[PDB]
Amino acid sequence: NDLIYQDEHASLQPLEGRTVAVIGYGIQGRAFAANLRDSGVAVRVGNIDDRYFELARAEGHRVTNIAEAVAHADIVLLLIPDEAHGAVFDVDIAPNLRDGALLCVAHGHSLVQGDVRPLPGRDLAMLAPRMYGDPIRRYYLAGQGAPAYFDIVADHTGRARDRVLAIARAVGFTRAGVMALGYRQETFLDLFQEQFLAPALVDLVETGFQVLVERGFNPKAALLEVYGSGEMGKMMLDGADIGLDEVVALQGSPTCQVGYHRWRGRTLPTAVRELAARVLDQIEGGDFSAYLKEQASNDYASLDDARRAALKRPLNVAHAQVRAAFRFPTEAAGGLYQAA
Amino acid sequence: NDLIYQDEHASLQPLEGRTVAVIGYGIQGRAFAANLRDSGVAVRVGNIDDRYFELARAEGHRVTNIAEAVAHADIVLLLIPDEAHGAVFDVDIAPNLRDGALLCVAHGHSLVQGDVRPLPGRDLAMLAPRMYGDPIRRYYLAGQGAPAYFDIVADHTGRARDRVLAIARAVGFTRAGVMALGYRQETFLDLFQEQFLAPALVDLVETGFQVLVERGFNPKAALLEVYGSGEMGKMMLDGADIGLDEVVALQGSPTCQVGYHRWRGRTLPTAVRELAARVLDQIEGGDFSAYLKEQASNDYASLDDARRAALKRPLNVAHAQVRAAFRFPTEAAGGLYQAAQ
Ligand SMILES: NC(=O)c1ccc[n+]([C@@H]2O[C@H](COP(=O)([O-])OP(=O)(O)OC[C@H]3O[C@@H](n4cnc5c(N)ncnc54)[C@H](O)[C@@H]3O)[C@@H](O)[C@H]2O)c1
Ligand SMILES: NC(=O)c1ccc[n+]([C@@H]2O[C@H](COP(=O)([O-])OP(=O)(O)OC[C@H]3O[C@@H](n4cnc5c(N)ncnc54)[C@H](O)[C@@H]3O)[C@@H](O)[C@H]2O)c1
Ligand SMILES: CC(C)N(O)[C@@H](O)C(=O)O
Ligand SMILES: CC(C)N(O)[C@@H](O)C(=O)O
Ligand SMILES: [Mg+2]
Ligand SMILES: [Mg+2]
Ligand SMILES: [Mg+2]
Ligand SMILES: [Mg+2]
């Protein structure tokens, strides 16, 4: 039966007179640092010599190299890409982590691969948010939060749990709920969402677009209906709240509801369910782990090629034309990560 | 080449001294009425004797039966279920529509089936929002809007276009963009989104859940990842702005981006593409229209059974357990349709 912490199950008392080193200032790193600072937690950023170092400085943080940040920290949050954990842990973190210090990862992958390991007299934990940085930041400023999974991997102090949930409360995850889940299960779940579900959702959107265009439909209109209007995104996000079938029952015309229920449960052949199983096998069996280590060569050169190639896919060409001709409701993001 | 109207291409001048009758006060009707009123447009609500009649009165509208609303209107917006258009048009609208008055539908279906037809001396148009009511209302209050398609079917007055785009501006669609598209194409596009894409997206999420749970994954965790956390919804909504592949390039860890690009373009067998074509054939060929007419029997008895059955699917059982255990960042939808500006 599930262990789920909300605000009444956590306090910031464990962070009194303690310094948190946020290692990295990327998607997660920047949100953690901003939210920790605004919660009145003593925070510093450890970063290599790149644009993220300069960004952290521009946003008013105390920024040093990783080793110096760790040496002056009671809690260390390793929020850099997972493939870089091994080298940074061995060289920068392990030699500099004080007696009784807590190390946290936001993904179980480095723990699964043994790249991050328990150290004598130190604590090791996972606090893995179920959301990217901008929403974590916007939710936090609105007195809300995103969910997270946590796992106490090594508790040598006997205070690891209090300190992890104090970080979770400070960054706002306990406003949603922080559930106990093994780092191994989090890794496979998380990679499954990225490798099966996200690609398949976009593949299906893209399939809808290309079929409509092949059948002589206005390409701007095709793009808007399949996602460009924000309607399908809105359905899915409202669905997260009240249920996906429920959203259609609440917000769909009777015409829409009859159409939806005609094909609901009938659209996908068994081959999709089998592909999902295949993706899980690759994740659980080390095939993906090997693939990711290869792809991280030449600083993710192959990924840079894939990102640039995707921009010329018909869906993405059609998107650029639609977004040039239709204004989308956005929010000003200027100074979003500056002190509140 | 596409004809797209934004604020600078429309004005409220055509609505000066004119009354709009909003027929229905449902998902679309309530948002149209709220936004029109807030934009300074004289609005009447026409409705049968049901809860929507009472809600419209409670929210401070002038509410009568449909015939009386039409009789006292310059512009009539028929915002009731599409299968009800034919009878309401024949009995309530056609006999009571003033000379030079405009009738608007928000879906091309009744126009395709011949249930709504041009009337001598009157205008007929489609203004079809690409969004449901609550977002249309929320966007409006933020100085934003949702896109729409429009079509001028009949233009006796020679001012049908001016008046339709005036409505579109008052309800906020011109803040996004209002594109010219034929009612027939709008019908087929709209039904395709509802019958292929929406079912397929939820089937995909449900398959994700089923496979994780069947292999011993925590059901709450499985539910949260496939949509319950709001992450996939946020990805698709941010994707609407900057692009779906671009959201991953911007917001995904390198671990995430390498995983995504490994299977992107490779997840679906050819059978999914073929089913999309089949759904489009059923829509274009009259089969769905016949199915919808049959389904609208006993006031949508089958739909009521399907809605209640869907509550008992494992995904929806898991959803209720997750939502009791995790607090979701919602917006107080209470007060949404209260008078503004
Ligand atoms: N729901 C959407 O988001 C959406 C999107 C764009 C287009 N549309 C179109 O807008 C129109 C209205 O759809 P909706 O989703 O708002 O519907 P809805 O189910 O919310 O409509 C309910 C309203 O219709 C009235 N009504 C129901 N049956 C009636 C009957 N037999 N006679 C008279 N009035 C009756 C009710 O009294 C109530 O006012 C349709 O043409 C639909 O295709 C809907
Ligand atoms: N991105 C998300 O939304 C998300 C969600 C939950 C969990 N996570 C986890 O959070 C962690 C950070 O992911 P992210 O998406 O924020 O990453 P990111 O790509 O945004 O990380 C960029 C940051 O990492 C640093 N960095 C990059 N390569 C480095 C190297 N070789 N050595 C040292 N520092 C290096 C950069 O200087 C910068 O500060 C990962 O473990 C990831 O799995 C990410
Ligand atoms: C909410 C749906 C998907 N709308 O786009 C309308 O077309 C409808 O028929 O309900
Ligand atoms: C944004 C994604 C989908 N996150 O959920 C993270 O797990 C990641 O690895 O990026
Ligand atoms: Mg991840
Ligand atoms: Mg994730
Ligand atoms: Mg529709
Ligand atoms: Mg629609």
Side-chain angles (χ1 to χ4, degrees), chain A residues 23 65-73 76 78 84-101 103 115-120 122:
Chain A
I23 308 308
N65 63 78
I66 293 169
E68 180 169 358
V70 171
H72 297 80
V76 184
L78 181 52
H85 283 206
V88 170
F89 175 78
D90 285 349
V91 171
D92 299 325
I93 304 172
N96 293 294
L97 198 55
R98 296 172 177 173
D99 287 358
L103 182 60
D115 294 322
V116 176
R117 294 177 300 284
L119 299 167
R122 294 117 185 79

Side-chain angles (χ1 to χ4, degrees), chain A residues 129-130 190 193-194, chain B residues 225 231:
Chain A
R130 308 333 298 168
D190 196 71
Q193 191 212 54
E194 297 164 357
Chain B
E225 288 322 293
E231 194 172 31

Side-chain angles (χ1 to χ4, degrees), chain B residues 2-338:
Chain B
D2 296 312
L3 196 70
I4 300 162
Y5 288 76
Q6 283 168 13
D7 275 355
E8 70 264 22
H9 309 124
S11 106
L12 299 188
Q13 188 172 328
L15 304 188
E16 285 175 0
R18 272 181 184 72
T19 300
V20 182
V22 185
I23 311 307
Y25 197 77
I27 301 152
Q28 287 297 325
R30 187 186 188 192
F32 267 83
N35 293 4
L36 283 170
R37 166 166 67 183
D38 291 350
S39 294
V41 181
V43 47
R44 276 183 161 265
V45 179
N47 209 98
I48 62 165
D49 189 24
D50 60 15
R51 60 174 199 85
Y52 299 100
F53 193 101
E54 302 305 322
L55 184 61
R57 289 182 65 201
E59 288 181 330
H61 285 288
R62 288 210 200 242
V63 197
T64 65
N65 61 73
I66 292 170
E68 174 161 12
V70 173
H72 294 91
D74 303 299
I75 301 172
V76 182
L77 315 178
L78 183 51
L79 300 179
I80 69 176
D82 303 279
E83 276 306 308
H85 282 199
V88 165
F89 171 83
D90 288 351
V91 172
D92 297 320
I93 303 167
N96 294 299
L97 207 49
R98 287 174 172 168
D99 281 3
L102 169 66
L103 181 57
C104 292
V105 297
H107 188 32
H109 185 258
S110 61
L111 295 171
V112 169
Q113 298 304 127
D115 293 324
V116 174
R117 298 169 302 281
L119 294 166
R122 281 83 132 211
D123 302 346
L124 178 57
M126 180 186 72
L127 179 64
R130 311 329 300 170
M131 187 58 63
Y132 49 93
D134 286 344
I136 283 169
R137 182 52 178 170
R138 282 210 180 282
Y139 288 146
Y140 172 84
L141 289 167
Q144 299 165 332
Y149 311 144
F150 86 100
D151 191 11
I152 312 309
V153 177
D155 186 15
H156 177 273
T157 64
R159 312 212 145 278
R161 180 180 299 267
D162 285 321
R163 291 169 185 169
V164 168
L165 270 292
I167 296 285
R169 172 153 177 170
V171 176
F173 301 129
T174 51
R175 297 164 190 182
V178 177
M179 186 171 71
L181 197 72
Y183 65 81
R184 199 158 201 274
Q185 187 180 165
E186 190 284 332
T187 305
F188 300 164
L189 244 188
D190 199 69
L191 292 188
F192 176 81
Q193 194 215 52
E194 295 162 359
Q195 292 176 36
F196 175 72
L197 183 54
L201 290 180
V202 179
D203 282 8
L204 208 35
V205 165
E206 180 167 70
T207 307
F209 174 77
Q210 284 172 348
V211 168
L212 291 172
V213 156
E214 279 166 19
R215 295 179 56 140
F217 284 85
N218 184 291
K220 290 204 182 62
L223 194 288
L224 283 168
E225 288 322 293
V226 296
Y227 79 97
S229 72
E231 194 172 31
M232 291 296 93
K234 273 300 283 181
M235 177 189 75
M236 295 213 68
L237 183 53
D238 286 347
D241 189 26
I242 58 159
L244 291 166
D245 291 313
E246 186 58 20
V247 164
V248 171
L250 166 61
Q251 302 288 19
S253 76
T255 309
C256 169
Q257 295 188 40
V258 171
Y260 176 89
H261 283 297
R262 189 182 199 179
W263 282 107
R264 176 76 171 87
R266 303 200 308 134
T267 57
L268 305 183
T270 63
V272 178
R273 186 164 61 234
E274 302 273 58
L275 180 124
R278 194 163 323 116
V279 172
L280 210 45
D281 293 344
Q282 295 180 320
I283 290 166
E284 291 181 354
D287 178 275
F288 175 66
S289 285
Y291 176 83
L292 174 61
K293 193 103 73 156
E294 291 170 324
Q295 279 284 314
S297 77
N298 308 129
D299 182 32
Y300 296 89
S302 275
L303 175 55
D304 292 332
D305 292 347
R307 187 182 61 249
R308 283 190 295 260
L311 298 179
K312 299 156 192 193
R313 297 178 78 88
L315 185 77
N316 293 317
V317 170
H319 179 86
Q321 287 168 9
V322 166
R323 193 52 52 235
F326 297 83
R327 308 177 68 151
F328 192 86
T330 74
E331 323 195 0
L336 190 50
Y337 294 91
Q338 295 193 330

Side-chain angles (χ1 to χ4, degrees), chain A residues 20 22 24-38 43 61 77 79 104 106 127-129 133 136-137 167-168 170-171 173 337:
Chain A
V20 183
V22 183
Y25 199 77
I27 299 155
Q28 288 298 320
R30 187 185 190 192
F32 267 84
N35 290 2
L36 283 166
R37 177 168 56 181
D38 288 349
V43 60
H61 286 291
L77 314 185
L79 302 176
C104 291
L127 181 61
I136 287 162
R137 182 52 179 172
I167 294 291
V171 177
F173 302 125
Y337 293 95

